From Swiss-Prot, chain A:
Belongs to the eukaryotic ribosomal protein eL31 family. The gene is rpl31e. The keyword Ribosomal protein applies. GO terms for molecular function: structural constituent of ribosome. GO terms for biological process: cytoplasmic translation. The keyword Cell division does not apply. It comes from the Archaea. This is Large ribosomal subunit protein eL31.
UniProtKB/Swiss-Prot annotation, chain B:
One of its GO terms (biological process) is translation. Gene3D superfamilies: Ribosomal protein L39e. Keywords: Ribonucleoprotein, Ribosomal protein. Belongs to the eukaryotic ribosomal protein eL39 family. One of its GO terms (molecular function) is structural constituent of ribosome. One of its GO terms (cellular component) is cytosolic large ribosomal subunit. HAMAP family: Ribosomal_eL39. Pfam families: Ribosomal_L39. The keyword rRNA-binding does not apply. This is Large ribosomal subunit protein eL39.
From Swiss-Prot, chain D:
GO terms for biological process: translation. The gene is rpl37e. This is Large ribosomal subunit protein eL37. It comes from Methanosarcina acetivorans (strain ATCC 35395 / DSM 2834 / JCM 12185 / C2A). Zn(2+) binds at C19, C22, C34, C37. Keywords: Metal-binding, Ribonucleoprotein, Ribosomal protein, RNA-binding, rRNA-binding, Zinc, Zinc-finger.
From Swiss-Prot, chain E:
GO terms for cellular component: ribonucleoprotein complex; ribosome. Part of the 50S ribosomal subunit. Contacts protein L29. InterPro entries: Nucleotide-bd_a/b_plait_sf (IPR012677), Ribosomal_uL23 (IPR019985), Ribosomal_uL23-like (IPR013025), Ribosomal_uL23/eL15/eS24_sf (IPR012678). It comes from Methanosarcina acetivorans (strain ATCC 35395 / DSM 2834 / JCM 12185 / C2A). This is Large ribosomal subunit protein uL23. Pfam families: Ribosomal_L23.
Length: 86, 51, 151, 56, 82
RNA sequence: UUAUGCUAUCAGGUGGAUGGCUCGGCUCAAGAGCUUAUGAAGGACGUGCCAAGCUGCGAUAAGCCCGGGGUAGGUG
RNA sequence: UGGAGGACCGUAAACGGUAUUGAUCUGCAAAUCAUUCGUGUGACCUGCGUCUCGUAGUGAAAUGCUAAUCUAACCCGGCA
RNA sequence: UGUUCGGGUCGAAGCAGGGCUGUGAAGUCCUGUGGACCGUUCACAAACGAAAAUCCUGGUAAUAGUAGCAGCAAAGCAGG
RNA sequence: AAGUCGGCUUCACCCCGGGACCCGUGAAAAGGACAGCUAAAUGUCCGUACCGAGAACUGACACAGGUGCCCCUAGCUGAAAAGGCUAAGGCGUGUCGGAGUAAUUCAGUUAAGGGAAUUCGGCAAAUUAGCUCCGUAACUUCGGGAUAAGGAGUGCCUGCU
RNA sequence: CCCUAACUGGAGUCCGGUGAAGCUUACAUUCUAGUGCACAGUCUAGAGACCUCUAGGGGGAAGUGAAGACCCCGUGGAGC
RNA sequence: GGUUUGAUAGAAACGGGAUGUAAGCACCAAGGCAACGAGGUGUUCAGUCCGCGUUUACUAACCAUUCGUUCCUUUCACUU
């Protein structure tokens, strides 16, 4: 079952280097890579919650937040579930 | 919705039913010697000289 | 699911709405995919698997508030005016309303007997010539020069 | 407007229709004549010696 | 010269049997009057109306609406459709 | 095992020359030589169980009838 | 008051094609695109139909246009 | 082509490579491949010999995994 | 499931009438009306799908051109069918990714002080800009020049004429 | 413009997929001078030069595009 | 350059900065009979933010691979 249940603050300042209209789906990739590296899993096993995607796309494709706070759970199968956190 | 007469529509129908592949049984009968066809075409190309 | 595109197009046709107004249940995907005919689509619609999403209109409350203020006479100043004076109030319309008011006033006066024909003719031509700004001006002139046959 | 591809977009009609007599799409819709076989001009078939070379 | 070639048996054409209509491939030379008279001679049923269209196969299709109830079913059974 | 390369040969791919074959073409000679309103030639459309082209045929539609030759296969 | 004018401004309605001597220049395009511009109730623009053509037509006239061809089009023939 | 004399399924023509001869045009032979035609004497003919024509037709390189797949127009992301 | 009512406005559509202009004085013919009512029968033939265009046409192309256009187009702002933001409807349809993603380049934003010294030339870019009010020269064919020039105001709220 | 700087989006740069065309007798890592049809990477004598790859602007290849539209000639044309 | 024998990067907090006093609440507000009311004051140098630093192993610098052997072999300095 659940292996770890950790909360993270993912910084998205490197997302700003990308051309502005690409920033939202650059930040999605940054979130997925952050979770891959910190949970020690594969890219295809990191599942991002609708809350996370909503927050990343709240202000349009050009103005994602400079950071996002998430709660990530790692299971024995290797799958990771990440949700938005207050 | 251009308006054709009976003969024009008949000739378009003939062109449409000509635009078909050679039958597989015809290919078998000719031993893969008649596989091609001069009246094959596509609708979005050089138009028919029929209408 | 395979393509539900055929089912979505048929459902939009059956509902009389746009293609994106049609909402297909993302859980009843195989139930939708089993639906082939108009009757099947109607059954899905009646059982709620397929529905037309509500039209998202354009709200008008913040325009109603502005319209109320404009009726009161605010939010309509020189810094808000952008068309010419004449495009905002046509001069023929102004003249038509003014002259019709004056003519109706003269007609009512001659009907009720305050104005005999001799002075009515001159007053009517004066009004047609623009001597009077409005019915109030006409009445003020009448009361000033005692044209009404008071009794 | 250019005499080339721009003006070539106005080509949504015809000057010649299919000929009853010869089947060629050569029947002038204005002169009511086939420029291939001569139908609508002559009871004979339209032929000239200059359609081939002088045979020598 | 019979105008009727043969009864036309597709899904939509078979849908006519439940409304007593019958669809035929007919000679494109012939008209509605000839089709009606020839069908009435062929099967002994009074024809109520004829609808006709031309297809992109170069064929002419005629839907015949009969006056006697069950005439379409009886003609289909006589032909061998049903 | 010195890569990237160069030269020659060999094996293979591509390609379709060469050779051989050919029911086609060309030229010459000898014959034969008109046809259509009793609707010609030509064209359009249709016509095959599966048939799209050509060819033949014309709603009797790759065909129908009669006489002769041919005779056991035929369905271009 | 009235509402005239080959009147005025103005639409990426329509028509035209000034300047950038910009983009493009084996192009999106055998001449187009962006911005900037001229006309925009009239000698206006435009559909469809119809007519006028090769020593001829058409031309508010540049030898412009007459099917990407014009100081005499194109096809075939004279022609090897 | 006429004519003389031949070769070939125990492997002709052609093709790739090689040996020998001849100043040479070229001839002959060997190996492999190929599967049915080919030479030779004396003569006679010609649609008879190609490295070139911005030659023609066909095939195929370098360029080169290069340019392009960028103004259209904010073009996609999450989950299933 | 309700399904009942009122009011305002109304183009760019329908009816009707008036006026002005001539300088093109602005079609013809079929058909219809003026005497028809009732009842049966008949009304054949051709087209009809779909695109009608930044992918169904045309330009050799799934071509940024061109091709009849509509006597087609909702809310706010606004003179407006301009421009902006939104409905309905149609779409994400025509290569991706990417670590500063260097230099360079196409198209843009901004730029101290100077302000055409640049250049053949103010080319390009910048300035001004709507509406209201005041005011408006030389010259003139008396029409104009004219939005000349040059000045002032403009938002929101409360209450009003 | 003095006199340029920073920034935005699209290209470019790097990666995956797709995938052309144009110059080409050959060879080719050149530079200087001379010579030569008097404007040479190839001749002559010197001087240099280890090879391969990537990016970059275009000095040269009298670069490519094209049987010079200027001039003359042709007992060649056309129009006027 | 660092890689647990660690402050390399990030999180958290704080320092140092940017902006200009957040939302809600209360009082006032020209006036309006009232409903309301642009805005002012206090809460509040607040609120929001930091592609800088410090402290701090809290997560990630883990797990490994590869060359330094010509490869197969016993043409061996070796081991089943």
């Amino acid at each position: 079952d659940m292996v770890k249940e950790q909360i993270y603050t993912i910084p998205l300042r490197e997302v700003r280097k990308v051309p502005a209209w690409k920033r939202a789906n650059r930040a999605v990739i940054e979130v997925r890579g952050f979770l891959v590296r910190h949970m020690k899993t594969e890219s295809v096993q990191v599942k991002l919650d609708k809350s996370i995607n909503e927050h990343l796309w709240e202000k349009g494709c050009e103005k994602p937040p400079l950071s996002i706070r998430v709660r990530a759970v790692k299971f024995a199968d290797g799958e990771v579930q990440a949700e938005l956190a207050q | 919705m251009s308006h054709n007469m009976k003969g024009q529509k008949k000739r378009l129908a003939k062109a449409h039913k000509q635009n078909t592949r050679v039958p597989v049984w015809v290919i078998v009968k000719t031993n893969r010697k008649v596989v091609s066809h001069p009246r094959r075409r596509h609708w979005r190309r050089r138009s028919l000289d029929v209408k | 699911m395979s393509d539900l595109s055929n089912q979505r197009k048929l459902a939009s046709k059956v509902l009389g709405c746009g293609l994106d107004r049609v909402w297909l249940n993302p859980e009843a995907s195989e139930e939708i995919a089993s639906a082939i005919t108009r009757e099947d689509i109607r059954g899905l619609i009646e059982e709620g698997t397929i529905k037309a999403k509500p039209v998202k209109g354009v709200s008008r409350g913040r325009a109603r508030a502005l319209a109320a203020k404009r009726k009161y006479g605010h939010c309509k100043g020189h810094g808000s005016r952008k068309g010419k004076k004449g495009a905002r109030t046509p001069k023929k319309e102004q003249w038509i309303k003014k002259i019709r008011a004056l003519r109706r006033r003269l007609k009512e006066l001659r009907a009720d007997g305050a104005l005999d024909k001799s002075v009515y003719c001159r007053l009517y031509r004066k009004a047609k010539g623009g001597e009077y700004r409005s019915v109030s001006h006409l009445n003020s002139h009448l009361e000033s020069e005692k044209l009404l046959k008071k009794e | 407007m250019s005499k080339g591809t721009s003006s070539m977009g106005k080509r949504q009609k015809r000057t010649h229709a299919k000929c009853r007599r010869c089947g060629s799409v050569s029947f002038n819709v204005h002169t009511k004549q086939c420029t291939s076989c001569g139908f609508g001009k002559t009871s004979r078939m339209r032929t000239y010696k200059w359609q081939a070379k002088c045979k020598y | 010269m019979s105008s009727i070639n043969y009864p036309f048996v597709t899904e939509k054409a078979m849908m006519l049997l439940d409304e007593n209509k019958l669809q035929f491939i007919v000679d494109t030379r012939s008209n509605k009057k000839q089709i009606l008279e020839d069908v009435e001679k062929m099967y002994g049923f009074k024809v109520k109306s004829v609808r006709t269209m031309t297809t992109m196969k170069g064929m002419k299709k005629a839907v015949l609406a009969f006056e006697e109830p069950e005439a379409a079913h009886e003609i289909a059974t006589r032909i061998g459709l049903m």
